[PDB]
């Protein structure tokens, strides 16, 4: 049957919000919600070869702060800090010149056990006509060797260009979905294939959170 | 399948007459969940019973209700279809319950005026074993002796 979104079911209990701001009124509350969505999608869609895992937004009456964690920030930084000013001008055009931007590119630790870049690597393999079984086996074993818990990958679509759509599941370990205390990271991606659309879903388990609290604690940023 | 009888809401204390049955019949004539209206109806009807029969209403009410109590109950069992009514002895709690439901149902159909006089007329008509609740009890009683044969087989 249908299941509730794993990330959305754990928000406000064990997971903090990706955007943290309080608006003045309901008219400026709509702009500040669409603006971060355009901004967030920009980082992920283009500038993808960087494996950006998550972008958080923090806004006050007039000051915009962006915190972008990546595995390879060299592509953002560019040649002698080139690409970075460009993205800054891009961001300024999106929100407006009247505000203050405060980019804070932060390098990420333990990049693998993040469901965003793993899904991105999966999506890249499928678009590159790489066989799904072979592509999947390498990603699962490398993630598992990194020293994490079970990973759940759902790859539904017109598998291998077929005319009848299927779905392939692959569990490897204990995935307690009914538990709220687990640190489960969820992400979804659209693999654009020449024969249609492929849906990839990645559930990753990063241990048990035995410290109560709405996070306020670094996530997959700490090193081994 | 249930094979379990969880606590049956047990309450009895009565104030005006200390007769649990008064509280039961109040709840029976209750409609739309208005306790005050039904209690006024019963107490005004009880007040009406003082002015006619010149005796204690509780004694008259028990004498009516004890008279309405049925003895046999004809239930339903299968036999190639339909049911050859099998007579069974009803417990005392249900026995009183069936009596109270019947008194109210025949009271709310009389040609009389406000249910005060209506239920009062109905109850007084049942204290002399000649009324509408009696006939129903008579009817259910008369039907059971005729269908005495199938009493041995129940299920």
């Amino acid at each position: 049957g249908q299941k509730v979104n794993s990330n959305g079911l754990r928000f406000g209990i064990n997971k903090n919000w990706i955007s943290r701001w309080t608006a003045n009124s309901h008219a400026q509350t709509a702009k500040w919600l669409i603006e971060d969505e355009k901004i967030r999608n920009l980082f992920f869609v283009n500038y993808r070869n960087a494996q950006v895992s998550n972008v958080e937004i923090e806004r006050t009456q007039a000051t915009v702060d962006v915190f972008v964690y990546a595995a390879q920030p060299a592509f953002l930084i560019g040649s002698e800090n080139k690409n970075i000013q460009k993205i800054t001008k891009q961001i300024k055009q999106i929100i407006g010149r009247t505000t203050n931007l405060d980019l804070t590119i932060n390098e990420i630790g333990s990049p693998m056990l993040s469901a965003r870049i793993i899904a991105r690597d999966l999506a890249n393999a499928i678009e590159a006509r790489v066989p799904l079984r072979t592509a999947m086996r390498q990603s699962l074993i490398k993630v598992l060797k990194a020293g994490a818990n079970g990973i759940k990958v759902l790859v539904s679509g017109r598998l291998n260009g077929a005319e009848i759509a299927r779905d392939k599941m692959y569990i490897e370990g204990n995935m307690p979905l009914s538990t709220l205390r687990a640190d489960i990271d969820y992400a979804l991606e659209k693999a654009q294939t020449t024969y249609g659309v492929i849906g990839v879903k990645v559930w990753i388990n990063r241990g048990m959170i035995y410290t109560k609290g709405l996070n306020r604690t670094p996530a997959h940023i700490l090193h081994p | 399948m249930r094979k379990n009888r969880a606590p049956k809401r047990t309450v009895l204390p009565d104030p005006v007459f200390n007769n649990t049955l008064v509280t039961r019949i109040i709840n029976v004539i209750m409609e739309d969940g208005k306790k005050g209206l039904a209690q006024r109806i019963l107490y005004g009807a009880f007040d009406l019973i003082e002015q006619r029969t010149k005796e204690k209403p509780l004694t008259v009410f028990e004498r009516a209700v004890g008279n309405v109590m049925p003895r046999l109950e004809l239930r339903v069992r299968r036999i190639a279809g339909s049911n050859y009514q099998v007579p069974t002895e009803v417990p005392q709690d249900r026995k009183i319950a069936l009596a109270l439901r019947w008194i109210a149902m025949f009271a709310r159909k009389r040609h009389e005026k406000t249910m005060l006089e209506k239920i009062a007329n109905e109850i007084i008509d049942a204290s002399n074993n000649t009324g509408a609740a009696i006939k129903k009890k008579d009817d259910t009683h008369k039907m059971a002796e005729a269908n005495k044969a199938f009493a041995h087989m129940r299920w």
Partner: protein, 104 residues
Amino acid sequence: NAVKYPELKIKLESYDSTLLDLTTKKIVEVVKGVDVKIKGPLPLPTKKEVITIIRSPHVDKASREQFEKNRHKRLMILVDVNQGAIDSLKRIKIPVGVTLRFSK
């Protein structure tokens, strides 16, 4: 010695609770490190809004989940502040989520 601000009524409200408790603790600690008599960090009723939205895209209005957004609120009124407190009040840095309603 001076006051320059009598009856400074600071009001706090935020979508989150724990951040709000942490911030009031920091505010009280700073304001008691200076010479101000805090009346007390009392809690006010939390205004909760709930929006009901149909899960399904096309049909089945019956299946509808629900969401909530709580506006936790606190009050704290300072009697006399003076520059000794006011100047130290400038370096507090309140985490974004928390909202201030200083009414002077």
